C-alpha cells in the first residue's frame, strides 16, 4: 500500500460526477448543478488533482470555462492561464484575461501554485515569457497590447544587491532564470512584435548572446542555440522582401550605396547566412564590379586571366595614376575589382622574379625593394590595428614570418 494519491481518500460521488462532467464537458449538468449544489468545491482527486477550472481548460471547453469563471470562489485561475497559454488556446486565454482580479497588470507570491505548493513552469516564468516561449503570435500580441514587457536579464558580472541576494541560497536557479528570460527575448514573436524595428535589436542581441556564451562556461551550447535562432530570424526576415526598396531598407537601412555600416556590422558579428543570401550577394556584386560592367557579364574566367595578364604591366597604370587622376582609367583604377586584379597580378610578378632569379644584382635589388614594399604594406596595415587584432588570424602571422625571413 505504497501508492501515492492527491486526495487521502475518494470522498464525494456527487462531486466526482461533477468532475467527470467537467472533464468531458457536459454543460447542462454543470449548469443545472451550479446553483443546487451545497457548495462548489475544489475537487482535485486525480493523478495530478487539477481543479474543475483547470481540468476544463486542459481539454478546451469554452462554455464551461465561462460558466466557472462566474463562480467567484475559484482558485488556480492564474495557473489555468499559464496552462492555457502552454496549450495555445486563444479563446480560453482571452476569456480568462477578462476575469476579475486580472485588471491592469497582474504580471511581473501565492499566485499560480497549483495544489498548495510546487507550481509548474519554473515559478520564475510570467505569462508573457511562456507566451513568446511557445511562439504564440495572437497571445503575445494580446499580452503586449495590455502592456506586459519582458524584464531584462540584468547582468552576469554585476552583483548589485537583489542579484547578489538571489545568488546565495537561491543558487543554480539564478542561471536557470537567466537563460529562461534570454530564451524569452530571443524568439521571433517577441522580436517582431516588441520593438520599433526587429533587425537592429536582433543583431545586437545576437552578439550579446555570443559574448555571454563565452563568459559562462556552462550552458554554452544553449546560448549558441539561441543566438543561432536569432540569426536565422534575421536571415528569414531579409528573405521575404520582394522589392528593391525593401531589400535596401533591410540591408542598408537609413561612393556606391552610401552609409553602409550594417553589412560591415553583420560581418563584424559573424552572422553567417545573412551575408551569404542571394539578394545580399547581388547587392555586393553591384558594388563590387561597379564601374566595369563589361567583365561583370563576361563569359569565362579565362578572359579574366587575359585581363590580369594585361594588368600585369605597371608603367602605364602607375604613370597614369601618379601624373594625372580622374581619367577614364582614373575612374576605373578606383574600384573594388581593379585593386584586386592589380594587387594579385603584382604578387604573381613577384613570384616570377623569384623564379627568374633562381634559374640564373638587378633581380636582387628588385626582390629587395619588393619585400620592402611588403613590409611597408604591413606598416599601413598594422597602423589601424591593435596588436591583438593584427594577431587574430593564424595566416596573418605566417605572412609576417615569411617577409621577416626574407629580411633576415
Amino acid at each position: 500500500a505504497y501508492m501515492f494519491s492527491d486526495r487521502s481518500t475518494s470522498l464525494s460521488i456527487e462531486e466526482e460526477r461533477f468532475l467527470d462532467a467537467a472533464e468531458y464537458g457536459n454543460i447542462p449538468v454543470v449548469r443545472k448543478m451550479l446553483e443546487e449544489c451545497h457548495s462548489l468545491n475544489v475537487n482535485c482527486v486525480d493523478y495530478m488533482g487539477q481543479n474543475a477550472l483547470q481540468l476544463a481548460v486542459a481539454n478546451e471547453h469554452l462554455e464551461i470555462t465561462e460558466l466557472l469563471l462566474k463562480k467567484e470562489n475559484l482558485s488556480r485561475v492564474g495557473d489555468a492561464l499559464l496552462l492555457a497559454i502552454s496549450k495555445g488556446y486563444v479563446r480560453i486565454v482571452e476569456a480568462i484575461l477578462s476575469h476579475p482580479a486580472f485588471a491592469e497588470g497582474k504580471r511581473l507570491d501565492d499566485f499560480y501554485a497549483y495544489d498548495e505548493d510546487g507550481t509548474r513552469f519554473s515559478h520564475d516564468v510570467t505569462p508573457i515569457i511562456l507566451a513568446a516561449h511557445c511562439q504564440e503570435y495572437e497571445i503575445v500580441h494580446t499580452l503586449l497590447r495590455k502592456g506586459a514587457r519582458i524584464e531584462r536579464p540584468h547582468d552576469y558580472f554585476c552583483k548589485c544587491n537583489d542579484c547578489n541576494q538571489k545568488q546565495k541560497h537561491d543558487s543554480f536557479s539564478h542561471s536557470r532564470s537567466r537563460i529562461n528570460a534570454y530564451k524569452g527575448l530571443a524568439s521571433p514573436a517577441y522580436l517582431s512584435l516588441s520593438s520599433e524595428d526587429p533587425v537592429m535589436t536582433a543583431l545586437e542581441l545576437s552578439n550579446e548572446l555570443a559574448v555571454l556564451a563565452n563568459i559562462e562556461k556552462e550552458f554554452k551550447n544553449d546560448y549558441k542555440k539561441l543566438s543561432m535562432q536569432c540569426k536565422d530570424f534575421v536571415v528569414g526576415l531579409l528573405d521575404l522582401c520582394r522589392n528593391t526598396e525593401e531589400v535596401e531598407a533591410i540591408l542598408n537601412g537609413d561612393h556606391g550605396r552610401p552609409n553602409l555600416s550594417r553589412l560591415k556590422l553583420a560581418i563584424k558579428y559573424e552572422v553567417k547566412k545573412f551575408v551569404a543570401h542571394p539578394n545580399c550577394q547581388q547587392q555586393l556584386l553591384s558594388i563590387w564590379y561597379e564601374n566595369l560592367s563589361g567583365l561583370r557579364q563576361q563569359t569565362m574566367a579565362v578572359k579574366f586571366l587575359v585581363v590580369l595578364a594585361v594588368a600585369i604591366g605597371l608603367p602605364f597604370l602607375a604613370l597614369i595614376y601618379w601624373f594625372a587622376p580622374c581619367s577614364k582609367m582614373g575612374k576605373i583604377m578606383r574600384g573594388p575589382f581593379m585593386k584586386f586584379v592589380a594587387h594579385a597580378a603584382s604578387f604573381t610578378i613577384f613570384l616570377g622574379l623569384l623564379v627568374m632569379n633562381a634559374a640564373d644584382s638587378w633581380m636582387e635589388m628588385l626582390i629587395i625593394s619588393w619585400v620592402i614594399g611588403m613590409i611597408w604594406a604591413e606598416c599601413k596595415e598594422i597602423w589601424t590595428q591593435g596588436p591583438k587584432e593584427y594577431l587574430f588570424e593564424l595566416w596573418n602571422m605566417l605572412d609576417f614570418g615569411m617577409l621577416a625571413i626574407f629580411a633576415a
Binding site: 454543460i27 521575404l240 522582401c241 614594399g373
Partner: protein, 99 residues
Amino acid sequence: DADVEWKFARAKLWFSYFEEGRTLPVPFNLRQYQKIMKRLIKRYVLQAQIDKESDEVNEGELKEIKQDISSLRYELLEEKSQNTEDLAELIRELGEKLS
C-alpha cells in the same frame, strides 16, 4: 553549409577592399523606412503562421476534437429534452382544455 561559409569568407575577402584607396604594392614617395518595416513585419508574421500550419499533427488536437464532439452530443441531447418538456406542457394544457 560549406557554400555559406565560402560566401562569407569571400565577403570578408573582397569586403576588405572598399574602405581605403590602395594604389599598388609599390608606394613610392608619397516616413518610407517605417512603412517598409510594417510591410516586412506583416509579411513575416503571416508567413510564420503558414509555416506553423504546414507541419504535421499533434495527438492532443485529436483529443481536443473528441472532447468537442462529446460536448456537442450532450448539448444537442439536452436541447431535445427541453423541447420535449415544453411540448408536453402544451399537449397536456390542450388535453385539460378539452376535458
